[PDB]
Write a protein that binds this ligand. Structure first.
Ligand SMILES: *[C@@H]1O[C@H](CO)[C@@H](O[C@@H]2O[C@H](CO)[C@@H](O[C@@H]3O[C@H](CO)[C@@H](O)[C@H](O)[C@@H]3O)[C@H](O)[C@H]2NC(C)=O)[C@H](O)[C@H]1NC(C)=O
Ligand SMILES: Nc1ncnc2c1ncn2[C@@H]1O[C@H](COP(=O)(O)OP(=O)(O)CP(=O)(O)O)[C@@H](O)[C@H]1O
Ligand SMILES: *[C@@H]1O[C@H](CO)[C@@H](O)[C@H](O)[C@H]1NC(C)=O
Ligand SMILES: *[C@@H]1O[C@H](CO)[C@@H](O)[C@H](O)[C@H]1NC(C)=O
Ligand SMILES: [Mg+2]
Lengths: 328, 870
């Protein structure tokens, strides 16, 4: 019929190969070695996370007796809460200020998609032609909404500030800087203003503000590098969270010039303009101050998980060892 | 052309049409939860790769035209059932979450002012709309590349049969061929083997040994070189002096007639140009018999339409040929009518004694001891062809000859009109004697018949040769040993009648074809007859399959395919038919796996088969190496293919709870595209082609490993839901370990991977590594390309993903590519890598522990010999 088949390693099923078999002397060391690797990492992360100092102030006022419950029914648009908290142990180094939102589904399909990417990327064509994707907020009355979409529309628009109550009882404001609170790529690549011109007023011609926003996107900040689509607060909002209960970076408190702690232990008051309504869907607002750590942030779950898995792997090795010993 | 290509790819295959129906679902925007990219690109590649496996054939056919001018596997049936099971599970889960979204929307969705879209859709409608949303996000449960991967697995495995060098016969220079590239796993599931005897269990390299005429047996040592005869050759080794001088001198009419018949009743074409009077016989019996006849001076020189050129001891006497009664498996005997120059019409005949003795003359004193002679030759595995002759009166021949010529009336009449002439003349026959010819078992057949029996393959042999020769050949090839209590049809017949009327180690069933029909007998009355037919037919198979061996004798081609059908219908056992010669093609088509020996009878019953190697000896490697590996390589492929796909989509089902059941994809939109084709497609294919539980030499030495496939222990309908339970858990771990790690702080600073984009990068990353590490656990043959594909899959993902999330690609598609700066930011943070390591360790270590316990507590035979390297 045909000639002799060629004699090559692949064709004759004779490729050189290692035949690993899960011998009792091979699975056991990896199980115990994992026990001696996860545990020290698990205790390492746990104690490192437990060292982090954090304070979470829930200032939504849903519960009665909180002395700004009036803001749940804001007859006057400007409402204010003054929540006092005292820190037992002073914060050291950079202190990060976040705002938290709970039971707030930022990962809804109708929500995450509702946005125009070319518009935020600084596309002139898409500036006056919002995509169909941000359908419910394409245009307000006659001309398109510049930050279209259900995401840019429902933006966290509270005004959080911190005061230090010293012995004199006079509130001393503590510096909060709004710059450098977004990913480098988001500021420098993903989000951009429309091209052309120098004044932001002339760039956004034929575009209104979103319906919920009180003021246009032109002057979200006085800094020319922080006004428009490249605004730090706005960018931090559009970065959709993965779960309902999230918290987003708001302000930074960098190291003080003096050797004293950045936030010395003492009486502080949180002066916040209650603008965001969340009590309709049982949403909770929180203000979170956290201190920087070299090994990420405060993640007690991983430390407990590594210890939990580290112990299971060590136990599994012993259990597997016993079974091998009996059935040897 | 190509337009027909996709036309039958879609309709014929349910999965291929399922995804086309999905594009329509993804086209409409009111329910499109995934982009159209997510289905075309995995579809075009699957529809593109399969085109290459068939288009290359057509273009070759087109070139051929210019130059010149069904069997479905058992798993193939299961695979269809799995895919129809995934549809139901997908429809139930999609309907289950559709309920959950309507109730979520009614309570939380309607009260949520941020999720306002301006479309007053009632919560019952919003749930309905997202029922199609979860037919799209969770669509990938149905494996798109299952139907293309299996073709590559089977094609590659089949091509190992062609390239095999141990399955290659040198002197005849014909390697093994696998002419069906879809029956590979079924070679490892064979329960029965039906084999021809002559040409399959014997070489059909024949030589004349003995003889008997008028009761006097010749060919023994009593009272040599044939130099006295010019036509003779030394190839024939004969030691019988008495017949040599008797035929040389003092010749008698008996020996003259007997040898003359062998050189007249033949049908062998002859050549004389070489000067040695070469012969080329289509039937080994005829060629050897004439080759033996010429050795004694009865040499056949030439033949034409009206005469012959036979020679007798140098006396070249030319006869006249009038009619030749053709031979077939039904007739079982050949005859020729020849007119001598004297003017007498002499009819010669030969064939099986069974059909010739019934037509003998009343006066035949040599009939009795000739039967004893015939039995004597069969005792040494010698095929016997009885002879006979008769004379036809001139007066009665005229009308018969005219009728014989009139029988050639064209049309289909010649099928039986000739036969009517055949039986109307063959009334009285004068016995002459019987021949004795030697056939020898192929090399390593007794090794194979013993080897395959160790794998619990019941070897049935279906042979048209005599009762005695088959029984002794069965003993010769170790098919029947000294422990066998043979029984015949009468023993079977009595048992069946006894039970039928009442209700109204090694054993054999050596039974003749005549007794095969007798037991089976081959408005209300018709129904009862059909009921009787099924009752006895079912009783026979249950009586036959209960014994290790079976010998079927005097069986025509109709009775070969019949028996194969009986086992198939009434036992549900996979069958293999191996044979040579046109008589076996009826059974090669009936059997699940059809094997064809090239043999000496003809190159005919191999093109009508599935595998066409040269010798029965090679059946050791087809089943115990290629068939056995092909089964485990296919099952290991399926046990992982469902896992890697059913553990991929289920994150969408778990993430549905923390997003309002809104059908939000936990993965990147462009990661769903490449996962099925790019990230987790190469390593599984390389497994199904290059995996070996034990070495080839060590799989022959332990045929018991074959049993894993006969009983179907490696991929049941039960092990489908253990790979799904594996898929559910892996998706549960892949989701809830990242979720637990992000509910709390995760590297939260100016560069914080806590958003959703870093949630898709973490789950997808730990998913790619987990499956590509769990395939590494599956492969038992870590060749230097299995490692490359496994690590290539993981390294490829981190290469493309960086490119996709790189700032440069953002220019090409600001909208379609919207993940920029996530991969280069979500994996430089240690907590993300501490979550991926934990998500992989806690997802793979339980598999290692589960696998190790199974080895230690319930070791399999494959593992038992793998532990002992020697
Ligand atoms: C801060 O954000 C909140 C919500 O994110 C803003 O409340 C929203 O205010 C808009 C009006 O600017 C409301 O839209 C419509 O207002 C008209 C009156 O012009 C009213 O008749 C409609 O019924 C409708 O409410 C919107 O409803 C309201 N949000 C909610 C949940 O009711 C708020 O104005 C923002 N404040 C600043 C200073 O940016
Ligand atoms: N040309 C031929 N002339 C006379 N008899 C023949 C013959 N070919 C076969 N026979 C005889 O017919 C009987 C059956 O022959 P058949 O044509 O059915 O195939 P077979 O049985 O020889 C193949 P196998 O041996 O593998 O079963 C045998 O007994 C044989 O002796
Ligand atoms: C919070 O601090 C303010 C200002 O010091 C004070 O007027 C108010 O009474 C304090 N409230 C409580 C509950 O201590
Ligand atoms: C809080 O901030 C507002 C706005 O700057 C200011 O008017 C007020 O005096 C501050 N202190 C309060 C409300 O106690
Ligand atoms: Mg045969």
């Amino acid at each position: 019929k045909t000639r002799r088949p060629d004699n090559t390693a692949f064709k004759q099923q004779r490729l050189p190969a290692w035949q690993p078999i899960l011998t009792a002397g091979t699975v056991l060391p990896i199980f115990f070695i994992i026990g001696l690797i996860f545990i020290p990492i698990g205790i390492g992360i746990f104690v490192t996370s437990n060292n982090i100092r954090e304070i979470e102030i829930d200032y939504t006022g849903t519960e009665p007796s909180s002395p700004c419950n009036k803001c749940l029914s804001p007859d006057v648009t400007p409402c204010f809460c003054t929540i006092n908290f005292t820190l037992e142990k002073s914060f050291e180094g950079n202190v990060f200020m976040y705002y938290g939102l709970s039971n707030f589904y930022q990962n809804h399909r109708r929500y995450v998609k509702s946005r125009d990417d070319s518009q935020l990327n600084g596309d002139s064509s898409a500036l006056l032609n919002p995509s169909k994707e941000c359908e419910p907020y394409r245009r307000n009355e006659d001309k398109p909404i510049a930050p279209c979409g259900a995401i840019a529309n429902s933006m966290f628009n509270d005004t959080l500030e911190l005061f230090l109550i010293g012995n004199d009882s006079y509130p001393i404001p503590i510096a909060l800087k709004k710059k450098g609170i977004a990913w480098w790529t988001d500021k420098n690549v993903k989000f951009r203003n429309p091209p052309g011109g120098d004044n932001l007023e002339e760039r956004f011609k034929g575009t209104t503000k979103p319906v919920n926003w009180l003021k246009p996107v032109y002057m979200l900040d006085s800094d020319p590098d922080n006004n428009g689509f490249i605004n730090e607060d706005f960018i931090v909002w559009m970065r959709t969270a993965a779960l309902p209960t999230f918290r987003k970076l708001y302000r930074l408190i960098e190291r003080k010039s003096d050797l004293h702690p950045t936030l010395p232990a003492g009486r502080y008051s949180l002066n916040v303009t209650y603008n965001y309504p969340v009590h309709y869907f049982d949403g909770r607002k929180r203000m979170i101050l956290s201190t920087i750590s070299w090994m990420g942030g405060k993640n007690p779950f991983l430390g407990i998980a590594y210890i939990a898995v580290g112990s299971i792997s060590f136990l599994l090795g012993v259990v597997l060892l016993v079974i091998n010993h009996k059935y040897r | 052309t190509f337009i027909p290509m996709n036309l039958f790819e879609q309709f014929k295959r349910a999965a291929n049409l399922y995804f086309l129906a999905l594009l329509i679902l993804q086209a409409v925007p009111q329910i499109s939860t995934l982009a159209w990219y997510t289905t075309l690109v995995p579809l075009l590649v699957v529809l593109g790769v399969t085109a290459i496996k068939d288009l290359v054939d057509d273009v070759a056919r087109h070139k051929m035209d210019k130059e010149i001018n069904f069997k479905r596997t058992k798993i193939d049936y299961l695979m269809n059932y799995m895919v129809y099971t995934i549809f139901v599970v997908l429809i139930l889960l999609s309907a289950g979450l559709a309920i959950g979204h309507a109730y979520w929307e009614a309570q939380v969705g309607n009260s949520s002012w941020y999720l306002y879209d301006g479309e007053d859709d009632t919560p019952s409608y919003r749930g309905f709309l997202i029922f199609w949303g979860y037919i799209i996000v969770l669509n990938t449960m149905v494996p798109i590349s299952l139907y293309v991967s299996v073709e590559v697995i089977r094609l590659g495995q089949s091509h190992f049969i062609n390239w095999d060098l141990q399955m290659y016969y040198a002197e005849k220079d014909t390697p093994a061929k696998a002419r069906t590239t879809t029956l590979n796993e079924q070679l490892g599931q064979i329960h029965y083997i039906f084999s021809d005897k002559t040409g399959t269990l014997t070489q059909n390299i024949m030589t004349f040994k003995k003889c008997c005429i008028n009761g006097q047996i010749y060919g023994d040592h009593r009272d040599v070189d044939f130099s006295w005869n010019t036509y003779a050759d030394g190839k024939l080794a004969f030691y019988d002096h008495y017949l040599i001088e008797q035929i040389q001198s003092g010749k008698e009419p008996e020996v003259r007639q007997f040898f003359f018949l062998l050189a007249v009743c033949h049908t062998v074409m002859v050549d004389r140009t070489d000067g040695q009077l070469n012969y080329q016989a289509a039937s080994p019996d005829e060629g050897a018999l004439v080759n033996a006849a010429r050795n004694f001076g009865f040499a056949f020189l030439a033949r034409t339409q009206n005469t012959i050129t036979i020679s007798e001891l140098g006396t070249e006497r030319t006869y006249n040929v009038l009619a030749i009664l053709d031979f077939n498996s039904d007739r079982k005997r050949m005859s020729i009518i020849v007119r001598t120059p004297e003017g007498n019409i002499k009819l010669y005949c030969k064939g099986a004694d069974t059909v010739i003795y019934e037509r003998l003359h009343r006066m035949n004193p040599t009939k009795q001891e000739t039967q004893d002679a015939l039995d004597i030759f069969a005792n040494e595995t010698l095929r016997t062809l009885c002879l006979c002759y008769k004379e036809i009166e001139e007066k009665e021949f005229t009308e018969w000859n005219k009728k014989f010529m009139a029988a050639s009336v064209a049309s289909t009449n010649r099928d039986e009109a000739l036969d009517k002439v055949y039986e109307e003349i063959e009334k009285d026959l004068i016995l002459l004697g019987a021949t004795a010819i030697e056939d020898k078992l192929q090399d390593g057949v007794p090794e194979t018949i013993s080897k395959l029996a160790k794998a619990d393959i019941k070897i049935w042999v279906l042979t048209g040769d005599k009762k005695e020769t088959a029984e002794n050949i069965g003993f010769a090839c170790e098919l029947l040993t000294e422990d066998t209590t043979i029984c015949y049809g009468e023993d079977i017949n009595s048992l069946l009648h006894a039970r039928m009327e009442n209700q109204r180690g090694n054993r054999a069933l050596i039974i003749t074809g005549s007794w095969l029909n007798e037991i089976l007998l081959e408005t209300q009355s018709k129904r009862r007859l059909e009921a009787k037919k099924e009752q006895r037919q079912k009783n026979f198979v249950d009586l036959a399959c209960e014994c290790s061996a079976v010998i079927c004798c005097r069986v025509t081609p109709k009775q070969k395919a019949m028996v194969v059908d009986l086992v198939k219908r009434y036992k549900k056992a996979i069958t293999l038919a191996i044979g040579d010669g046109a008589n076996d093609v009826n059974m090669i088509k009936t059997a699940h796996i059809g094997v064809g020996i090239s043999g000496q009878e003809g190159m005919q019953a191999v093109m009508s088969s599935d595998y066409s190697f040269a010798q029965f000896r090679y059946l050791q490697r087809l089943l115990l190496v290629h068939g056995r590996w092909s089964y485990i390589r296919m099952c290991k492929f399926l046990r992982y293919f469902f896992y890697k796909n059913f553990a991929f989509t289920l994150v969408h089902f778990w993430y549905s709870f923390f997003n309002g059941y809104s059908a939000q994809t936990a993965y990147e939109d462009w990661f769903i595209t490449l996962y099925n084709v790019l990230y987790t497609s190469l390593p599984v294919l390389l497994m199904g082609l290059l995996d070996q539980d034990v070495s080839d030499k060590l799989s022959l030495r332990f045929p018991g490993l074959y049993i894993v496939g006969q009983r179907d222990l490696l991929f049941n309908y039960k092990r489908f839901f253990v790979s799904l339970l594996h898929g559910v858990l892996t998706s549960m771990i892949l989701f809830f370990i990242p979720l637990g790690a992000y509910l709390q702080t995760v590297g939260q600073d100016g560069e914080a991977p806590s958003d959703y984009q870093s949630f898709a990068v973490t789950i997808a990353s730990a998913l790619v590594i987990t499956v590509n590490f769990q395939i590494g656990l599956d492969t038992s043959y870590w060749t230097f390309v299995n490692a490359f594909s496994i690590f290539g899959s993981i390294a490829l993902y981190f290469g493309i993903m960086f490119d996709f999330h790189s700032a440069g690609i953002h220019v090409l598609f600001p909208s379609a590519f919207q993940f920029t700066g996530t991969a280069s930011n979500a994996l430089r943070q240690p907590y993300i890598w501490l979550t991926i390591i934990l998500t992989v360790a806690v997802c793979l270590l339980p598999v290692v522990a589960i696998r190790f316990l199974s080895m230690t507590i319930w070791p399999s035979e494959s593992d038992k010999i793998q532990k002992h390297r020697k």
